[PDB]
Amino acid sequence: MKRTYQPSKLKRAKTHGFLARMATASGRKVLKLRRKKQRAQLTVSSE
Amino acid sequence: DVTNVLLKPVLTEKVYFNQMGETKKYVFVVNPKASKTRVKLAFELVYGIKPLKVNTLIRKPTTIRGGSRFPGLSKLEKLAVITLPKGIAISV
Amino acid sequence: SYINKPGKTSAWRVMTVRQQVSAVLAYGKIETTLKKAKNTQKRLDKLITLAKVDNFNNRRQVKKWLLNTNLFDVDQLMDHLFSKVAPKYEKTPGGYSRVLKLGPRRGDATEMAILQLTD
Amino acid sequence: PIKKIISRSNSGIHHSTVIDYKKLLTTNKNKPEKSLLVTLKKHGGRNNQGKITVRHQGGRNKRKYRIIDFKRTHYDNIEATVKSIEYDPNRSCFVSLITYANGAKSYIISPDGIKVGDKILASEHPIDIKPGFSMPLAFIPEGTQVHNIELHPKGGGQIARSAGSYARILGQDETGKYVILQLLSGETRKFLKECRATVGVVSNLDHNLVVIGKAGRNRHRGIRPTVRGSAMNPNDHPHGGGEGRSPVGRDAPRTPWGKRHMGVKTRNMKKASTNLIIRNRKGEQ
RNA sequence: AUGAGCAGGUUGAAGGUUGAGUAACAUCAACUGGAGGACCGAACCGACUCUCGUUGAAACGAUAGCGGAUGACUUGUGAUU
RNA sequence: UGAGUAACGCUUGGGAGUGAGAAUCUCCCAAACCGAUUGACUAAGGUUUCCUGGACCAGGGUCGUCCUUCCAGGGUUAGUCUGGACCUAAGCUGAGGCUGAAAAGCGUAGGCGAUGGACAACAGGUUAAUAUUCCUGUACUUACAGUUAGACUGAUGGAGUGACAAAGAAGGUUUUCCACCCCCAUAAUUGGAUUUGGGGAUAAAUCAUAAGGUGGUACAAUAGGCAAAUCCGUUGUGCAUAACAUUGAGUGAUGAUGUCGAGUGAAAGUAGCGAAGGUGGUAUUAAUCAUGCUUUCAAGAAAAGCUUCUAGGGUUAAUCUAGCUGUAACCAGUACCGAGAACGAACACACGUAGUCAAGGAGAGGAUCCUAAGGUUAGCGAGUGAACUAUAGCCAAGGAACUCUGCAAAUUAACCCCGUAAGUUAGCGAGAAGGGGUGCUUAUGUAAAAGUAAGCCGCAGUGAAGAACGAGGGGGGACUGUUUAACUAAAACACAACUCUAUGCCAAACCGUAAGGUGAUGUAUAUGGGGUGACACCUGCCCAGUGCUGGAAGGU
């Protein structure tokens, strides 16, 4: 059966890309505090 | 040429099969940023020999050591395979 | 009762016994299930008895219970049968073969029977 | 004229007709000349905001804009010859391709009665009157069918340029300005004489005799199907939602917005043209 | 916006053509004709009936089907709320 | 703990060996299904899962010597394929720039943006992993620089092109099909017999013939296209009778003495070998011509790219064409799985999963039953075959007595031929109703058949396969349709249609705070609102009051 999530990695990059998240101030601040949050992955490119 | 991009040749069974032919195909691991223009240049300047033909590929990194206590990731490397004129080769 | 292994009826046991009699005629030995051996002994005795008249009617008849392999063809089996098997076992009123009880298998720990025929 | 639609369908009955498109038009096959056509994109009902900002509209079949002269002053005193009558699927009428005698082909709005090959002339100077003439109001007497009127002079005719629309002059303001016009839908203004006009009636007058027929045909022609307000959700509209045909309880009913909008006019009472009010669609002043 | 597809075989209306025919009409004969939120009907869509699954093949479906099935088309890609 | 309770998640048997030990490892044999797939292509997806060897310690719904399990090593090659370098569709960003406590929102030039366009290769070969990539042979393009000759070139801007729907029809064209020919193999131990099966050709690329199509070919003034114009234009004239230009199947010559082959088959069925490589049409087929053609209305893309004219200039050749020569053609991808144990699904599950060829008997079929290569026995087996249950196959006779009810279940079916009414908006009804037929041998029958006649046969003849059940009365809605995803499918909703209402252009309305935008590039015959909601005839009254609108005195 068709499911809720598709592994379309290009649409994945568009939806949750690093360059997309640095184009928004909220995303930039989130990545800053996630650097402060000890997370290994911040975006898809920083996995 | 930085005289470092010619990292190392490898001799595997498929490489042995390639070299036991007539055009003396060899393989060099190289920096994946260079174009075949300057790669071929580095080759005709390191010796007197110009490559008959050039081909490029990369060994895509995979999860090395598989499922184990200490897994990891494999290395990044680009293999350039060179065919030479039939009667000539390189003595590495 | 939707799609699954549905179990086996008379057709499957018929094809199984035909394959088994062809296989025993290939060599002269089968190790199988005791129930199938008991089922096959009757047909084997009848087939040994049925091929002793040797005409085209009996040719088709005893041909109707043989299957093929590479070492032997169904034609090869009927030829071998008619050539040598029938004249030898005429000296007994039944009981051509012997089915003996072996030990259990390692696959299912079930009673395996060996069916054989010698003279 | 129109003709009954022949389909012989066995799913219900269709009581619809269709315009002939040949005794009023030409080339009933969409592949016209490549002179003055520009591709159009519909908004899908959305604003520039991305939000849907029109009601029950969406699903129009793709149509291409025909580049039509509206200012009609760049080519003045140059004689035009009607070369074709080509349909305009965007507007409610059919445009006409003409050729100014200097050698300039152009699409224009086609007034009623003009045909391919007719010879006309339009400029900014007082001349005689023939169908298709366009010439400023200051040189025209009252009592003529005029359309494509320009509230902002030198811009282009905007009012009364739909299917079979025009206006009649009910006199001229006795101060040498503001020619009095009877706008369609019953309005009557004292319109600026600084402006131009297109004489006669506009073609394609049978939009009073159009048949829509079914749902999806109109959906492809535009407007989407939707429910009335009084069957909407009880929060989005209190009259709807539930069992038993809950009818409208508000005298002068409203919209999703609390609009007491029955009979009340929403024309500005203090515009610079409010001193030019003569008649609003029912009465005087 | 960009695209793909709609097995199959179906109907012969309109239109137009020819002729008879009427002052002209009208009327009809035959011909081309191939329109259809037309037909059934593969695929396909939906979940309308039945059974099963009732801690499953399935955080929810599987059978026979049913209705619809060149359009109030489906579907794919991208955008978009 | 339940409890050994349940289950072990789409399909075998035998022989032989390995291994101490094998249903599950392998070889063989068969099977029966899928067969428009249970055959291969690839998009996307997974991205080493792909290959070799060793091994089975953590998983294999037990087993497991083995696994898609682990360990060690290894596999994907691109001047022409996909794509960057060609560009754009929606769309996005967007400096400067408009609005907004600010962050920010909006927004132009532009720049990003294929699922499209510009665009130069094909085939065989060969590994344990691939191969327009590697090789082999047969070709093509693109500039660069020099050279040979000719030769004027001309964008920034102008013109054209690209540039385009669905539905439908009948042809050209060669295939297809069949008869028949060649070649190869084949010769029958059962009754009978001189049988049976298969093959029969080749790409890019160049050249020639190009079927046919598409529908105008030249003279000049320019008052039109920011300009300038030799380019479109504009004007008629000459031809308008067929040229003119474009295109265009196919066919032939190479390519191609090449691969290859029926088949043969030595060390394995591997290598070698490899015969033939033919005609007629076709009332069967698609393909291409073909952006062809016809019709309809809801009217069906751009940029890139191409051509061209003038400016722009050059005219000691800047410069173009082509020959020849040389130089060189860059960046990235390439494994396999790929409808599914490698996507998702937490999943070794049976589900939904891009497009696409998709063969035979046989049929209208891509429907159906049985098949050609294919691949395997659905990660648990083996026995007896209790009740009880799922699945069925069946039950003689009544036959609706069952029920809240013909709910459910069960007669009709495919093809062919007769005949069909009420109502009816003339379209239906309708496969109404109601009946008959389906086989074979011979002849007749068109091109084969239909069809007919004679005979013969069956227990009956789409003999297996899968095939609308009707009739009438009633309610609603006309209808066709959307509809409460994982309870209700409607008589709910929608819809055509209608009365009223508002919106006159910088339209109102809506959004934001705003700019501003949709509205709308709409213009009353347009849009919105409110409700009524096939078709038809009508919708009567009441303004007490609320409200809607309007008004102007008077009070306020």
mmCIF file with all atom_site columns, N, CA, C and O (backbone and C1' of nucleotides) in Angstrom, chain F residues 120-135:
data_model
loop_
_atom_site.group_PDB
_atom_site.id
_atom_site.type_symbol
_atom_site.label_atom_id
_atom_site.label_alt_id
_atom_site.label_comp_id
_atom_site.label_asym_id
_atom_site.label_entity_id
_atom_site.label_seq_id
_atom_site.pdbx_PDB_ins_code
_atom_site.Cartn_x
_atom_site.Cartn_y
_atom_site.Cartn_z
_atom_site.occupancy
_atom_site.B_iso_or_equiv
_atom_site.pdbx_formal_charge
_atom_site.auth_seq_id
_atom_site.auth_comp_id
_atom_site.auth_asym_id
_atom_site.auth_atom_id
_atom_site.pdbx_PDB_model_num
ATOM 1   P P     . A F 1 120 ? 21.870 16.265  -34.086 1.00 0.00 ? 120 A F P     1
ATOM 2   O "O5'" . A F 1 120 ? 23.142 15.321  -34.234 1.00 0.00 ? 120 A F "O5'" 1
ATOM 3   C "C5'" . A F 1 120 ? 23.970 15.385  -35.386 1.00 0.00 ? 120 A F "C5'" 1
ATOM 4   C "C4'" . A F 1 120 ? 25.284 14.685  -35.154 1.00 0.00 ? 120 A F "C4'" 1
ATOM 5   C "C3'" . A F 1 120 ? 25.301 13.670  -34.022 1.00 0.00 ? 120 A F "C3'" 1
ATOM 6   O "O3'" . A F 1 120 ? 24.771 12.415  -34.409 1.00 0.00 ? 120 A F "O3'" 1
ATOM 7   C "C1'" . A F 1 120 ? 27.210 15.064  -33.875 1.00 0.00 ? 120 A F "C1'" 1
ATOM 8   P P     . A F 1 121 ? 23.885 11.560  -33.379 1.00 0.00 ? 121 A F P     1
ATOM 9   O "O5'" . A F 1 121 ? 24.894 10.461  -32.824 1.00 0.00 ? 121 A F "O5'" 1
ATOM 10  C "C5'" . A F 1 121 ? 25.954 9.967   -33.636 1.00 0.00 ? 121 A F "C5'" 1
ATOM 11  C "C4'" . A F 1 121 ? 25.677 8.565   -34.122 1.00 0.00 ? 121 A F "C4'" 1
ATOM 12  C "C3'" . A F 1 121 ? 25.034 7.638   -33.096 1.00 0.00 ? 121 A F "C3'" 1
ATOM 13  O "O3'" . A F 1 121 ? 24.241 6.679   -33.792 1.00 0.00 ? 121 A F "O3'" 1
ATOM 14  C "C1'" . A F 1 121 ? 27.106 6.747   -33.741 1.00 0.00 ? 121 A F "C1'" 1
ATOM 15  P P     . C F 1 122 ? 22.659 6.582   -33.542 1.00 0.00 ? 122 C F P     1
ATOM 16  O "O5'" . C F 1 122 ? 22.403 5.017   -33.390 1.00 0.00 ? 122 C F "O5'" 1
ATOM 17  C "C5'" . C F 1 122 ? 23.364 4.177   -32.766 1.00 0.00 ? 122 C F "C5'" 1
ATOM 18  C "C4'" . C F 1 122 ? 23.818 3.073   -33.692 1.00 0.00 ? 122 C F "C4'" 1
ATOM 19  C "C3'" . C F 1 122 ? 24.138 1.741   -33.038 1.00 0.00 ? 122 C F "C3'" 1
ATOM 20  O "O3'" . C F 1 122 ? 22.985 0.976   -32.732 1.00 0.00 ? 122 C F "O3'" 1
ATOM 21  C "C1'" . C F 1 122 ? 25.835 2.283   -34.588 1.00 0.00 ? 122 C F "C1'" 1
ATOM 22  P P     . A F 1 123 ? 23.034 -0.107  -31.545 1.00 0.00 ? 123 A F P     1
ATOM 23  O "O5'" . A F 1 123 ? 23.839 -1.336  -32.167 1.00 0.00 ? 123 A F "O5'" 1
ATOM 24  C "C5'" . A F 1 123 ? 23.250 -2.166  -33.158 1.00 0.00 ? 123 A F "C5'" 1
ATOM 25  C "C4'" . A F 1 123 ? 24.286 -2.949  -33.929 1.00 0.00 ? 123 A F "C4'" 1
ATOM 26  C "C3'" . A F 1 123 ? 25.088 -3.972  -33.139 1.00 0.00 ? 123 A F "C3'" 1
ATOM 27  O "O3'" . A F 1 123 ? 24.398 -5.193  -32.934 1.00 0.00 ? 123 A F "O3'" 1
ATOM 28  C "C1'" . A F 1 123 ? 26.559 -2.679  -34.444 1.00 0.00 ? 123 A F "C1'" 1
ATOM 29  P P     . G F 1 124 ? 24.519 -5.962  -31.527 1.00 0.00 ? 124 G F P     1
ATOM 30  O "O5'" . G F 1 124 ? 25.832 -6.853  -31.674 1.00 0.00 ? 124 G F "O5'" 1
ATOM 31  C "C5'" . G F 1 124 ? 25.871 -7.966  -32.558 1.00 0.00 ? 124 G F "C5'" 1
ATOM 32  C "C4'" . G F 1 124 ? 27.291 -8.338  -32.905 1.00 0.00 ? 124 G F "C4'" 1
ATOM 33  C "C3'" . G F 1 124 ? 28.168 -8.790  -31.744 1.00 0.00 ? 124 G F "C3'" 1
ATOM 34  O "O3'" . G F 1 124 ? 28.008 -10.161 -31.424 1.00 0.00 ? 124 G F "O3'" 1
ATOM 35  C "C1'" . G F 1 124 ? 29.302 -7.129  -32.958 1.00 0.00 ? 124 G F "C1'" 1
ATOM 36  P P     . G F 1 125 ? 28.236 -10.673 -29.917 1.00 0.00 ? 125 G F P     1
ATOM 37  O "O5'" . G F 1 125 ? 29.793 -10.456 -29.655 1.00 0.00 ? 125 G F "O5'" 1
ATOM 38  C "C5'" . G F 1 125 ? 30.773 -11.175 -30.393 1.00 0.00 ? 125 G F "C5'" 1
ATOM 39  C "C4'" . G F 1 125 ? 32.154 -10.617 -30.156 1.00 0.00 ? 125 G F "C4'" 1
ATOM 40  C "C3'" . G F 1 125 ? 32.669 -10.721 -28.728 1.00 0.00 ? 125 G F "C3'" 1
ATOM 41  O "O3'" . G F 1 125 ? 33.230 -11.987 -28.440 1.00 0.00 ? 125 G F "O3'" 1
ATOM 42  C "C1'" . G F 1 125 ? 32.988 -8.521  -29.512 1.00 0.00 ? 125 G F "C1'" 1
ATOM 43  P P     . U F 1 126 ? 32.604 -12.901 -27.278 1.00 0.00 ? 126 U F P     1
ATOM 44  O "O5'" . U F 1 126 ? 33.671 -12.808 -26.097 1.00 0.00 ? 126 U F "O5'" 1
ATOM 45  C "C5'" . U F 1 126 ? 34.993 -12.346 -26.335 1.00 0.00 ? 126 U F "C5'" 1
ATOM 46  C "C4'" . U F 1 126 ? 35.468 -11.479 -25.198 1.00 0.00 ? 126 U F "C4'" 1
ATOM 47  C "C3'" . U F 1 126 ? 34.963 -11.884 -23.822 1.00 0.00 ? 126 U F "C3'" 1
ATOM 48  O "O3'" . U F 1 126 ? 35.725 -12.922 -23.229 1.00 0.00 ? 126 U F "O3'" 1
ATOM 49  C "C1'" . U F 1 126 ? 34.598 -9.578  -24.131 1.00 0.00 ? 126 U F "C1'" 1
ATOM 50  P P     . U F 1 127 ? 35.121 -13.753 -21.992 1.00 0.00 ? 127 U F P     1
ATOM 51  O "O5'" . U F 1 127 ? 35.734 -13.038 -20.707 1.00 0.00 ? 127 U F "O5'" 1
ATOM 52  C "C5'" . U F 1 127 ? 35.351 -13.444 -19.401 1.00 0.00 ? 127 U F "C5'" 1
ATOM 53  C "C4'" . U F 1 127 ? 35.687 -12.394 -18.373 1.00 0.00 ? 127 U F "C4'" 1
ATOM 54  C "C3'" . U F 1 127 ? 34.959 -12.511 -17.042 1.00 0.00 ? 127 U F "C3'" 1
ATOM 55  O "O3'" . U F 1 127 ? 35.551 -13.453 -16.163 1.00 0.00 ? 127 U F "O3'" 1
ATOM 56  C "C1'" . U F 1 127 ? 34.830 -10.283 -17.812 1.00 0.00 ? 127 U F "C1'" 1
ATOM 57  P P     . A F 1 128 ? 34.778 -14.810 -15.778 1.00 0.00 ? 128 A F P     1
ATOM 58  O "O5'" . A F 1 128 ? 33.329 -14.318 -15.327 1.00 0.00 ? 128 A F "O5'" 1
ATOM 59  C "C5'" . A F 1 128 ? 32.614 -14.976 -14.288 1.00 0.00 ? 128 A F "C5'" 1
ATOM 60  C "C4'" . A F 1 128 ? 32.324 -14.028 -13.154 1.00 0.00 ? 128 A F "C4'" 1
ATOM 61  C "C3'" . A F 1 128 ? 32.407 -12.554 -13.523 1.00 0.00 ? 128 A F "C3'" 1
ATOM 62  O "O3'" . A F 1 128 ? 31.176 -12.074 -14.026 1.00 0.00 ? 128 A F "O3'" 1
ATOM 63  C "C1'" . A F 1 128 ? 33.695 -12.962 -11.574 1.00 0.00 ? 128 A F "C1'" 1
ATOM 64  P P     . A F 1 129 ? 31.130 -10.800 -14.997 1.00 0.00 ? 129 A F P     1
ATOM 65  O "O5'" . A F 1 129 ? 29.827 -10.017 -14.527 1.00 0.00 ? 129 A F "O5'" 1
ATOM 66  C "C5'" . A F 1 129 ? 29.360 -10.119 -13.189 1.00 0.00 ? 129 A F "C5'" 1
ATOM 67  C "C4'" . A F 1 129 ? 29.465 -8.799  -12.467 1.00 0.00 ? 129 A F "C4'" 1
ATOM 68  C "C3'" . A F 1 129 ? 29.842 -7.605  -13.329 1.00 0.00 ? 129 A F "C3'" 1
ATOM 69  O "O3'" . A F 1 129 ? 28.736 -7.063  -14.027 1.00 0.00 ? 129 A F "O3'" 1
ATOM 70  C "C1'" . A F 1 129 ? 31.141 -7.604  -11.345 1.00 0.00 ? 129 A F "C1'" 1
ATOM 71  P P     . U F 1 130 ? 28.575 -7.304  -15.610 1.00 0.00 ? 130 U F P     1
ATOM 72  O "O5'" . U F 1 130 ? 27.653 -6.096  -16.084 1.00 0.00 ? 130 U F "O5'" 1
ATOM 73  C "C5'" . U F 1 130 ? 27.339 -5.035  -15.192 1.00 0.00 ? 130 U F "C5'" 1
ATOM 74  C "C4'" . U F 1 130 ? 28.142 -3.800  -15.508 1.00 0.00 ? 130 U F "C4'" 1
ATOM 75  C "C3'" . U F 1 130 ? 27.773 -3.085  -16.799 1.00 0.00 ? 130 U F "C3'" 1
ATOM 76  O "O3'" . U F 1 130 ? 26.664 -2.211  -16.686 1.00 0.00 ? 130 U F "O3'" 1
ATOM 77  C "C1'" . U F 1 130 ? 30.096 -3.463  -16.773 1.00 0.00 ? 130 U F "C1'" 1
ATOM 78  P P     . A F 1 131 ? 25.465 -2.299  -17.755 1.00 0.00 ? 131 A F P     1
ATOM 79  O "O5'" . A F 1 131 ? 25.970 -1.426  -18.989 1.00 0.00 ? 131 A F "O5'" 1
ATOM 80  C "C5'" . A F 1 131 ? 26.651 -2.020  -20.085 1.00 0.00 ? 131 A F "C5'" 1
ATOM 81  C "C4'" . A F 1 131 ? 27.909 -1.258  -20.417 1.00 0.00 ? 131 A F "C4'" 1
ATOM 82  C "C3'" . A F 1 131 ? 28.113 -0.869  -21.870 1.00 0.00 ? 131 A F "C3'" 1
ATOM 83  O "O3'" . A F 1 131 ? 27.354 0.265   -22.242 1.00 0.00 ? 131 A F "O3'" 1
ATOM 84  C "C1'" . A F 1 131 ? 30.144 -1.673  -20.938 1.00 0.00 ? 131 A F "C1'" 1
ATOM 85  P P     . U F 1 132 ? 26.523 0.271   -23.615 1.00 0.00 ? 132 U F P     1
ATOM 86  O "O5'" . U F 1 132 ? 26.386 1.818   -23.970 1.00 0.00 ? 132 U F "O5'" 1
ATOM 87  C "C5'" . U F 1 132 ? 25.809 2.236   -25.203 1.00 0.00 ? 132 U F "C5'" 1
ATOM 88  C "C4'" . U F 1 132 ? 26.866 2.498   -26.246 1.00 0.00 ? 132 U F "C4'" 1
ATOM 89  C "C3'" . U F 1 132 ? 27.959 3.477   -25.829 1.00 0.00 ? 132 U F "C3'" 1
ATOM 90  O "O3'" . U F 1 132 ? 29.180 3.116   -26.472 1.00 0.00 ? 132 U F "O3'" 1
ATOM 91  C "C1'" . U F 1 132 ? 26.809 4.338   -27.700 1.00 0.00 ? 132 U F "C1'" 1
ATOM 92  P P     . U F 1 133 ? 30.177 2.060   -25.782 1.00 0.00 ? 133 U F P     1
ATOM 93  O "O5'" . U F 1 133 ? 31.508 2.898   -25.530 1.00 0.00 ? 133 U F "O5'" 1
ATOM 94  C "C5'" . U F 1 133 ? 31.470 4.316   -25.407 1.00 0.00 ? 133 U F "C5'" 1
ATOM 95  C "C4'" . U F 1 133 ? 32.188 4.787   -24.167 1.00 0.00 ? 133 U F "C4'" 1
ATOM 96  C "C3'" . U F 1 133 ? 33.187 3.793   -23.576 1.00 0.00 ? 133 U F "C3'" 1
ATOM 97  O "O3'" . U F 1 133 ? 34.300 4.498   -23.026 1.00 0.00 ? 133 U F "O3'" 1
ATOM 98  C "C1'" . U F 1 133 ? 31.547 4.319   -21.962 1.00 0.00 ? 133 U F "C1'" 1
ATOM 99  P P     . C F 1 134 ? 35.633 4.713   -23.900 1.00 0.00 ? 134 C F P     1
ATOM 100 O "O5'" . C F 1 134 ? 36.680 3.679   -23.284 1.00 0.00 ? 134 C F "O5'" 1
ATOM 101 C "C5'" . C F 1 134 ? 36.265 2.701   -22.343 1.00 0.00 ? 134 C F "C5'" 1
ATOM 102 C "C4'" . C F 1 134 ? 36.904 1.359   -22.597 1.00 0.00 ? 134 C F "C4'" 1
ATOM 103 C "C3'" . C F 1 134 ? 37.106 0.974   -24.056 1.00 0.00 ? 134 C F "C3'" 1
ATOM 104 O "O3'" . C F 1 134 ? 38.276 1.537   -24.624 1.00 0.00 ? 134 C F "O3'" 1
ATOM 105 C "C1'" . C F 1 134 ? 36.096 -0.824  -22.908 1.00 0.00 ? 134 C F "C1'" 1
ATOM 106 P P     . C F 1 135 ? 38.358 1.820   -26.205 1.00 0.00 ? 135 C F P     1
ATOM 107 O "O5'" . C F 1 135 ? 38.571 0.381   -26.855 1.00 0.00 ? 135 C F "O5'" 1
ATOM 108 C "C5'" . C F 1 135 ? 39.741 -0.384  -26.591 1.00 0.00 ? 135 C F "C5'" 1
ATOM 109 C "C4'" . C F 1 135 ? 39.614 -1.782  -27.148 1.00 0.00 ? 135 C F "C4'" 1
ATOM 110 C "C3'" . C F 1 135 ? 39.349 -1.873  -28.645 1.00 0.00 ? 135 C F "C3'" 1
ATOM 111 O "O3'" . C F 1 135 ? 40.539 -1.810  -29.413 1.00 0.00 ? 135 C F "O3'" 1
ATOM 112 C "C1'" . C F 1 135 ? 37.801 -3.234  -27.490 1.00 0.00 ? 135 C F "C1'" 1
#
